[PDB]
């Protein structure tokens, strides 16, 4: 249901986009006012489509698992493109079924594999609304040599933005330029599963983490999160990966 047009995109229209994406995700409940996602849903209920439209009015449809906001694959015209991983093979039973051509991407949805495939670490891939527009275009035509980079842009501008207010704001503020994401942004992406897990545990442990989560802040300092008074809990994280989303 959720759509975003890059043409005329503002910091505001991008925020409306990311609040709608968040809103389209079922939750178990909230913890500390942070929505806690469902661990599991039936296949028929597990996937949603996000539509993104570049300056040229070319549209890609992106399939995400609503239990974890992982991107499973995308569709551009008659062609579907799914990550080479079991989660996406499963999604491909439910989504993009009338795609005439079905491609399996030569990588899993995992930043290490995507970075290897792009020959590029995230810290050197620009982000911003114009970056998102080139990603869409790159993916609409499936440059197999530029696609992995453009999947990292796409991932961070949807999935990651959805998960962290800091990521959202930082991307959406680049309306007519691009930026290189800080180690802070990267840290938050890397640490989502563990932070989420720790906040869950804290909920039956008086707000204490059982295990420190080490983040990098915007001054590049290593900082240790051990409780629910951390700024990352009260003023950043916007979605909790359920601890039971995997065995």
């Amino acid at each position: 249901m959720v759509s975003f047009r890059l043409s005329g995109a503002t910091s505001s229209s991008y925020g409306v986009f990311i609040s709608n994406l968040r809103k389209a995700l079922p939750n178990e409940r909230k913890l500390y006012d942070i929505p806690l996602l469902r661990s599991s849903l039936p296949g028929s209920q597990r996937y949603a489509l996000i539509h993104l439209t570049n300056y040229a009015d070319e549209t890609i449809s992106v399939a995400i698992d609503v239990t974890n906001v992982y991107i499973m694959g995308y569709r551009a015209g008659d062609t579907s493109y799914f990550f080479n991983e079991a989660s996406a093979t499963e999604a491909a039973k439910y989504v993009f079924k009338d795609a005439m051509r079905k491609v399996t991407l030569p990588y899993s949805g995992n930043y290490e594999r995507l970075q290897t495939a792009a020959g590029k670490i995230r810290e050197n891939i620009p982000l911003g609304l114009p970056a998102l527009d080139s990603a869409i275009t790159t993916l609409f035509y499936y440059n197999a040599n530029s696609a992995a980079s453009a999947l990292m842009v796409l991932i961070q501008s949807t999935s990651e933005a959805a998960r962290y207010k800091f990521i959202e704001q930082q991307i959406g503020k680049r309306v007519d330029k691009t930026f290189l994401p800080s180690l802070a942004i990267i840290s938050l992406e890397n640490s989502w599963s563990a932070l989420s897990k720790q906040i869950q545990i804290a909920s039956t442990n008086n707000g204490q983490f059982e295990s420190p989560v080490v983040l990098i802040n915007a001054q590049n300092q290593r900082v240790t999160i051990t409780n629910v008074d951390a700024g990352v809990v009260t003023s950043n994280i916007a979605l909790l990966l359920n601890r039971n989303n995997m065995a």
Partner: peptide, 10 residues
């Protein structure tokens, strides 16, 4: 709001 992310981490 900045790029300094003050209070959004620890």
């Amino acid at each position: 709001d900045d790029d300094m992310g003050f209070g959004l981490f620890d």
